[PDB]
Design a protein around this nucleic acid. Structure first.
Ligand SMILES: Nc1ccn([C@H]2C[C@H](O)[C@@H](COP(=O)(O)OP(=O)(O)OP(=O)(O)O)O2)c(=O)n1
Ligand SMILES: [Ca+2]
Ligand SMILES: [Ca+2]
Ligand SMILES: [Ca+2]
Ligand SMILES: [Ca+2]
Length: 342
DNA sequence: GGCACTGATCGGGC
DNA sequence: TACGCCCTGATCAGTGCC
């Protein structure tokens, strides 16, 4: 198969740059403000100029403002980004036999038939795709072209930003032999270190470790995944992913263990979650609590039937009481998640 | 044993 | 040092069952 993977550069910040071109070429940080104070929150993303200053996604805004105090800080406006994304996914769709929208930011296109199996016309289709997104939306993206999804994504990530990475069928075997473990999607920093400690630094090093010992360290799914990848037997099809859960979680004005203080937030979160569910009816509810130390504590329940908004209310309080009963810490954020849709 | 399911953790931007 | 919102999420121990 011939896969084109597309990944939008510094997405949220880039859209903000399209909407306010004066921000371009200067450090710009997109912030999620929690509302507790004026600066409390986290960084959703930063343009490359701000990343040069050390600004990272996930980082506390107050910490970003310390190392890059002259950056422009702006609030996240997720609906606009979703709108850009939707328009872009619609452009890609007409260039592909099958498309897998992986997230608001990225997609895989199977273009095998479309270019008559000719890999080099795939590259050109990838160039044509980048140019079109740039002309129509003023968004730069990075593209990876490869014989499978995983290699398409890896080479894309190596080519950022505004890149076009390529791995032809002839170079796959070679490429798999120098690939570092920490560069494989799905393998987090922790596991990569545990593998490194055991002498597993390259993907090819997976092939020489006893599989049963590997499974103990990585878990079965990751062990099968790594072994398939190492043997170039990864071939997963381009496929539409289905939404499995919908939720809402908010930061309270103050930490608390007071049921009556916490309840108004829990309920607003249910109201908003039900708006997002729309016609979906969930059989499972989970109440989620982020404690003062930023640990996450959850209690859930699956019903034999669908949960109406009013049942969600009553059951969510029972679950919240369960959390307060079984955990002694104060709660900073409170939310709900719904899943197991009929 | 192993299927089907469940509730819980917590990672990491899919 | 500080600290969001999201799950088109992965993982896995516990369970009842035949
Ligand atoms: N902790 C995070 C990480 C990411 N995102 C959102 C904002 C990102 O812009 C978007 C896309 O994620 P990416 O991993 O792809 O990172 P970027 O698009 O921002 O930058 P780039 O791909 O150029 O490295 O996801 C977020 O809300 N919170
Ligand atoms: Ca991405
Ligand atoms: Ca991106
Ligand atoms: Ca914990
Ligand atoms: Ca994950």
């Amino acid at each position: 198969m011939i896969v084109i993977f597309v990944d939008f550069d510094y997405f949220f910040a880039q859209v903000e740059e399209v909407l306010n071109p004066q921000y371009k070429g200067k450090p710009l940080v997109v912030c999620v403000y929690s509302g507790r104070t004026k600066t409390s929150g986290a960084v959703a993303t930063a343009n490359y100029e701000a990343r040069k200053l050390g600004v990272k996604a996930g980082m506390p805004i107050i910490k970003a403002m310390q190392i890059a105090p002259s950056a422009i800080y702006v609030p996240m406006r997720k609906p606009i980004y979703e709108a850009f994304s939707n328009r872009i996914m619609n452009l890609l769709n007409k260039h592909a036999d099958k498309i897998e929208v992986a997230s608001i930011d990225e997609a895989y296109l199977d273009v095998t038939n479309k270019v008559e199996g000719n890999f080099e016309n795939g590259i050109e289709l990838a160039r044509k795709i980048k140019q079109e997104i740039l002309e129509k939306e003023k968004i730069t993206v990075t593209v990876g072209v490869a014989p499978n999804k995983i290699l398409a994504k890896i080479i894309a990530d190596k080519s950022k930003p505004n890149g076009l990475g390529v791995i032809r069928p002839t170079e796959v075997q070679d490429f798999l032999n120098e690939l570092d473990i920490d560069e494989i999607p799905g393998i987090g920093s922790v596991l990569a270190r545990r593998l490194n400690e055991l002498g597993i630094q390259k993907l090819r090093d997976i092939l020489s470790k006893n599989y049963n010992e590997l499974e103990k360290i990585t878990g079965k799914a990751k062990a099968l995944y790594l072994l398939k990848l190492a043997q170039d037997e990864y071939n997963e099809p381009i496929r539409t992913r289905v939404r499995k859960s919908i939720g809402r979680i908010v930061t309270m004005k103050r930490n608390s263990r007071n049921l009556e203080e916490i309840k108004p937030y829990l309920f607003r979160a249910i109201e908003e979650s039900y708006y997002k569910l729309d016609k979906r009816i969930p059989k499972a509810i989970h109440v989620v609590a982020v404690t003062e130390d930023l640990d996450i504590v959850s209690r859930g329940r699956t019903f034999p039937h669908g949960i109406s908004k009013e049942t969600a209310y009553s059951e969510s309080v029972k679950l919240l009481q369960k959390i307060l009963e079984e955990d002694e810490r104060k709660i900073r954020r409170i939310g709900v998640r719904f899943s197991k849709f009929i």
